[PDB]
């Protein structure tokens, strides 16, 4: 997410367009954007088309015009010596497609090649007219869009969804790299800078959880320090782990430690799960998802989050305020977790409502306890406290003395209502978490991990997920092409080291140049048995499952395999809120808005229209009078309900009297006539 942020191109700013007054001609994909701005990765709401992303090979020239590399072709030969062009320059040449047939002899194998003629007009053209060539078939997309395998099999909308969703995944407690990645994951991780790279070559001397020490080749020692359990701008957890031993020799530029979402120096935003593609009892209905209970017991999709509570003691007109255990009216029992200074003990357990920093301010004794409390719905463990004291000549703001700060961290397991997604725009919330006993299990007794409904795929034109599932099964199972008597014709153009693989092999399919369908069929045709000479998945890629709830086998085979699932930052613990009474606004005496000051849900104008169309006058009247801004009515209704009385009658709202006063202030004699 940060790397994508650093490479953004925005049109709205002090000197640019406007988010509303901008038309539909500036939110378009222009032919000149080929290779300079990614056409897929844009926001989805009002900023659609106004914020873009720079491409991968593109650069900016001194005057501010973006350039993109091209490979000069001379006399019909695709030569070396890349030359950087601009849109203005590129408009007076003919450039060819990167994924084009060449035979290492500077002469196209096929007669005709699609080329952007002048105004981005793709055309079949004679082979002698080409003047330039794209560097790779991965040149128009950005960094995040280049990490979607089988991108060319997905429609633009779902590809945009997946590219945007890849930037919302939370770092899991333990990271694991995909099995079916693309390749743009090692450089993406190294350039992002969240990994630790050895400054200079040498031999590891002492490696610990907190520090690496490389003994350089000149007698110098440089100790790297790892940042453990730090907090990001968005509450996630940043944690570095060394991945080298005490005797290994490292080289300059080698990855010496891992980061939040990295595994061996490659991005790892999700986990590999065994999936089934059948409908099941209506629980995965309308984009809902079904998970096994193994992913909770074994902590497969668990994450750590950190909060930041800060409070300071001002000078105050009253004069002076102190933080200490001396909180009046409270027994020592409640202050058990508090210490001599006033802050809580590191390693303590805090629940919703608990003194974290006990203080008192004399509001004029006048001492008034305004101690920090754990927000509603918060809990965890206090893992760190930072206190800046004016007595220690700290760089504090003006008019303060102490700036004590606290950290509480808690591990969150996957629950019902959390959002998951793949890399192909397949999103959904968790409808149910079944016990691992009543789950469809293969003939050998292995349950599936996740179930995805069939009705969502063919409609949304994101078939890439099925191909990913097939190839993930092939990679996990391991395979061996039987070239006993010549390599099979479907493996003729398959590189060696790919004719055979061992279980849990990691492969890569570049974004626009990867595995063909014939290769997928061939690999599905030859996979290794599990423990016994049994192949659980046949050539079609479909297995024969058993009903764990009844025991009978399902009548037909089901598609099974391994796909890569990510856990988005849209957890249900953050989206649940309720209220009966609490803080109110001051001018228009209505409840406040927001989950963070209790606050109430707003009954808008279209809801009023609906209630009026139902012909329900009394519910509407109570909603608009006694639940919102009838000051006496609220207290009387509460006192009536707590007792067994009947609800009183509503009065006059409080937003009408304000309007009357404003109209009078505009020099208008407004009166109510009986």
């Amino acid at each position: 997410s940060g790397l994508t942020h650093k490479r953004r191109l925005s049109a709205l700013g002090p000197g640019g367009l406007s988010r509303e007054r901008a038309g539909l001609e500036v939110r378009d994909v222009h032919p000149s954007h080929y290779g300079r701005m990614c056409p897929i990765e844009t926001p989805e709401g009002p900023n659609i088309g106004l914020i873009g992303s720079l491409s991968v090979y593109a650069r900016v020239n001194p005057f501010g015009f973006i350039e993109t590399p091209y490979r000069k072709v001379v006399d019909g030969v695709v030569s070396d010596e890349i030359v950087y062009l601009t849109a203005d320059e590129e408009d007076r040449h003919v450039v060819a497609q990167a994924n084009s047939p060449i035979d290492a002899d500077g002469r196209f194998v096929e007669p005709r090649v699609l080329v952007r003629r002048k105004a981005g007009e793709v055309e079949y053209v004679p082979s002698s007219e080409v003047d330039y060539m794209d560097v790779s078939p991965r040149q128009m997309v950005s960094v995040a869009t280049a990490m979607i395998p089988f991108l060319e099999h997905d429609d633009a909308n779902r590809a945009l969804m997946g590219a945007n969703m890849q930037r919302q995944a939370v770092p899991l407690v333990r990271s694991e790299a995909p099995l079916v990645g693309t390749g743009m994951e090692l450089r993406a991780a190294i350039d992002a800078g969240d990994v630790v790279v050895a400054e200079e070559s040498g031999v590891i001397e002492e490696v610990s959880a907190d520090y690496i020490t490389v003994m350089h080749d000149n007698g110098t020692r440089r100790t790297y320090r790892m940042r453990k359990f730090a907090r990001s701008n968005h509450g996630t957890c940043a944690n570095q782990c060394p991945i080298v031993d005490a005797g290994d020799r490292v080289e300059a530029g080698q990855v010496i430690a891992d980061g939040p979402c990295t595994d061996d120096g490659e991005m790892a935003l999700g986990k590999n799960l065994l999936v089934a593609i059948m409908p099941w009892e209506g629980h995965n209905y309308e984009d809902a998802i079904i998970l096994s209970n193994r992913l909770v017991e074994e902590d497969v999709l668990t994450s750590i989050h950190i909060e930041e509570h800060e409070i300071d003691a001002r000078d105050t007109k009253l004069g002076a305020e102190e933080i200490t255990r001396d909180i009046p009216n409270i027994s020592d029992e409640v202050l058990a977790d508090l210490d001599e200074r006033g802050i809580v003990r590191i390693g303590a357990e805090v629940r919703d409502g608990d003194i974290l920093v006990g203080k008192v301010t004399p509001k004029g004794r006048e001492v008034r306890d305004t101690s920090l409390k754990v927000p509603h719905g918060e809990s965890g463990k206090v893992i760190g406290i930072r206190v800046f004291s004016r007595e220690d000549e700290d760089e504090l703001p003006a008019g303060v003395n102490e700036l004590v700060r606290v950290y509480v961290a808690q591990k969150r397991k996957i629950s019902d209502g959390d959002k998951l997604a793949g890399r192909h725009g397949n999103k959904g919330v968790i409808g149910k978490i079944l016990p691992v006993e009543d789950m469809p299990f293969l003939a050998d007794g292995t349950p599936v991990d996740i179930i995805l409904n069939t009705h969502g795929v063919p409609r949304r034109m994101n078939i890439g997920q099925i191909l990913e599932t097939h190839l993930g099964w092939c990679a996990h199972s391991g395979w061996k092409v039987d070239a006993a008597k010549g390599v099979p014709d479907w493996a003729a153009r398959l590189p060696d080291e790919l004719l055979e693989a061992q279980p849990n092999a990691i492969v890569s399919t570049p974004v626009f140049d990867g595995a063909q369908e014939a290769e997928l069929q061939g690999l599905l045709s030859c996979t290794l048995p599990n423990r016994d000479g049994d192949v659980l998945v046949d050539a079609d890629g479909k297995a024969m499952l058993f009903d764990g709830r009844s025991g009978e086998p399902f009548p037909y085979p089901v598609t099974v395999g391994y796909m890569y699932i990510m856990k988005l930052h849209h957890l249900v613990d953050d989206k649940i809120h309720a209220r009966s009474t609490g803080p109110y606004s001051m001018i228009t005496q209505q409840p406040l808005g927001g989950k963070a000051q209790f606050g109430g849900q707003r009954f808008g104008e279209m809801e009023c229209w609906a209630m009026q169309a139902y012909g329900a006058a009394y519910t509407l009247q109570e909603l608009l009078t006694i639940k919102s801004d009838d000051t006496v009515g609220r207290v009387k209704v509460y006192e009536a309900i707590v007792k067994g009385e009947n609800i009183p009658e509503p009065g006059i709202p409080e937003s009408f009297k304000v309007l009357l006063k404003e109209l009078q202030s505009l020099c208008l004699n407004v009166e109510v006539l009986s």
């Binding site: 090979y57 650069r59 080289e251 120096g265 399919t509 570049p510």
Partner: peptide, 30 residues
């Protein structure tokens, strides 16, 4: 067949690619 042969300590992730890349991806923060 492998993906990243330039980075010294890289995992051996094998690739299905058929086309050679003349140029290396530039620095992404340049």
């Amino acid at each position: 067949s492998s993906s990243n042969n330039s980075v010294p300590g890289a995992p051996n992730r094998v690739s299905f690619a058929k086309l050679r890349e003349p140029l290396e991806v530039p620095g992404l923060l340049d």
